[PDB]
Design a protein around this ligand. Structure first.
Ligand SMILES: *[C@@H]1O[C@H](CO)[C@@H](O[C@@H]2O[C@H](CO)[C@@H](O)[C@H](O)[C@H]2NC(C)=O)[C@H](O)[C@H]1NC(C)=O
Ligand SMILES: *[C@@H]1O[C@H](CO)[C@@H](O)[C@H](O)[C@H]1NC(C)=O
Ligand SMILES: *[C@@H]1O[C@H](CO)[C@@H](O)[C@H](O)[C@H]1NC(C)=O
Ligand SMILES: *[C@@H]1O[C@H](CO)[C@@H](O)[C@H](O)[C@H]1NC(C)=O
Lengths: 225, 49, 21, 50, 99
């Protein structure tokens, strides 16, 4: 099933604070009005760059290159106490699933867990790192705008080629997006929150707003590109 | 041109965190054999030498 | 003058900006 | 805005280009950087003159 | 030691110094090297935000790691000097003007 994503998927490109200015950034974001493969499964998914993830019950994310013990692989399991991120040469099944005291799937990083609402997660894999972004905002994606604050950084080093999700056996559905490199224009507020993002490759008014570094344009002629 | 100069120097850096395991390796009751040494990896911790 | 007041109110490292004489 | 551009050099910070690097190449890199900055300043002065 | 194969996490112990206020030094806040005064900040940050900037792409506010407070940055007061003088045929005295 396919469903258009209106405007969501905006995360902080850095940890730099800004106050009521406009900051042109060129990083890897989620484009606006791009279709996402809204699943309804109750296999394996390709990884280009980015696992923009949103669901409204499921916990777990398989990451790796071959998914097997031939090279390093990543594992994330979230429960009520903490989060364990185990990286090793781990052997996985074709369709792993959970049970909650028994493990049927087959350095660690113990911190606070990642817990109607909508758990929006944006994943990145560049410069040998791994970055988790999240924002639990209560409510076909709903019409609105919100930021995605950063979280812990995991030094891995290897490249990620394929990924998979998990099913938590007590299900639900989750959106999957894909990021591509482009340029946004983000409007920081006075307090320092991202509240409005405008693209730079859309209908030409958006590109004019990108190339004039302003949100409001007057009548006239503008040469852009 | 007139420019007032700094009079001293400071530096700030975060806490020494996770308390890197080295006392259990450099001060141990028993040790491995000279042919079957056990490799120990220490990471995810700012070292203190 | 009121016209001067209206006109003035409507009109709104290492680099140094000098003040006019 | 032009003050913080690399100008094709190694970096754009004096305390990074004159400490991490070795002066046989650091002299050439800082020469390139100050040449670019002086070119930008000359462009600004010409614009102000016109 | 294993080098040039992975991100580096076993770093040496970098020491820390004491607090300072209202006297511009060559500070170094988690690798951010700069010169400027250290004043109490009236701004409000967010917990994921490290250091601030402005329109002119310059650092204005920084957060120390030892405290949850934030310290503003303002550069040391620079200014050109000028010499008020009459003719040297008239008098030898001069007056110094700071801009
Ligand atoms: C890093 O060290 C500083 C200096 O001790 C810590 O700051 C205070 O530490 C004392 C000692 O436990 C606490 O009682 C205070 O509450 C701390 N003040 C603040 C503002 O945090 C600082 O907490 C340390 N950072 C850590 C532990 O993450
Ligand atoms: C997404 O796919 C649906 C069905 O294939 C289509 O109607 C819609 O126009 C697509 N979205 C965009 C932005 O083209
Ligand atoms: C959560 O999982 C971790 C291992 O991933 C385990 O150590 C912990 O006991 C679990 N907490 C529970 C079951 O409450
Ligand atoms: C910004 O912060 C002020 C208080 O400092 C508050 O009154 C205002 O509502 C905040 N604005 C937003 C958009 O959060």
């Amino acid at each position: 099933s396919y469903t258009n994503s209106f405007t969501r998927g905006v995360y902080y490109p850095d940890k730099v604070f800004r106050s009521s200015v406009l900051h042109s950034t060129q990083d890897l974001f989620l484009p606006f009005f791009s279709n996402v493969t809204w699943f309804h499964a109750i296999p394996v998914l390709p990884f280009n760059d980015g696992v923009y993830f949103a669901s409204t019950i499921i916990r777990g994310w398989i990451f790796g290159t071959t998914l097997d013990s031939k090279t390093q692989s990543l594992l994330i399991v979230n429960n009520a106490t903490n989060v364990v991120i185990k990286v090793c040469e781990f052997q996985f099944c074709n369709d792993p699933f959970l049970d909650e005291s028994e493990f049927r799937v087959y350095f660690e990083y113990v911190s606070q867990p990642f817990l109607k609402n909508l758990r929006e997660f944006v994943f990145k894999n560049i410069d040998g790192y791994f970055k988790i972004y999240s924002k639990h905002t209560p409510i076909d994606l709903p019409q609105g705008f919100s930021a995605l604050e950063p979280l812990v950084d995991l030094p891995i080093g290897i490249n990620i080629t394929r990924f998979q999700t998990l099913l938590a056996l007590h299900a639900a559905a989750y959106y999957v997006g894909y990021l591509q490199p482009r340029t946004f224009l983000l409007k920081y507020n006075e307090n320092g929150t991202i509240t409005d993002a405008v693209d730079c490759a859309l209908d030409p008014l958006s590109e004019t707003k990108c190339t004039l570094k302003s949100f409001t344009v007057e009548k006239g002629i503008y040469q852009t590109s | 041109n007139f420019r007032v100069q700094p009079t001293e120097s400071i530096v700030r850096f975060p806490n020494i965190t996770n308390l890197c395991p080295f006392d259990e390796v450099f001060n141990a009751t028993r040790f491995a054999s000279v042919y079957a040494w056990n490799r120990k990896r220490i990471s995810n911790c700012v070292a203190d030498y | 003058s009121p016209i001067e007041d209206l006109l003035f109110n409507k009109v709104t490292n290492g680099l140094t900006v000098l003040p006019p004489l | 805005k032009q003050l913080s551009s690399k100008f094709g050099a190694i970096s754009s910070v004096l305390n990074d280009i004159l400490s991490r690097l070795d002066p046989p190449e650091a002299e050439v890199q800082i020469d390139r950087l100050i040449t670019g900055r002086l070119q930008s300043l000359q462009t600004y002065v010409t614009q102000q003159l016109i | 030691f294993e080098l040039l194969h992975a991100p580096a996490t076993v770093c040496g112990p970098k020491k820390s110094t004491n607090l300072v206020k209202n006297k511009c030094v060559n500070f170094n806040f988690n690798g951010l090297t700069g010169t400027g005064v250290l004043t109490e900040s009236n701004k409000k940050f967010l917990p994921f935000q490290q250091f601030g900037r402005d329109i002119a792409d310059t650092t204005d506010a920084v957060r120390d790691p030892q405290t949850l407070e934030i310290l503003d940055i303002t550069p040391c007061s620079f200014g050109g000097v000028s010499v008020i003088t009459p003719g040297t045929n008239t008098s030898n005295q001069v007056a110094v003007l700071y801009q």
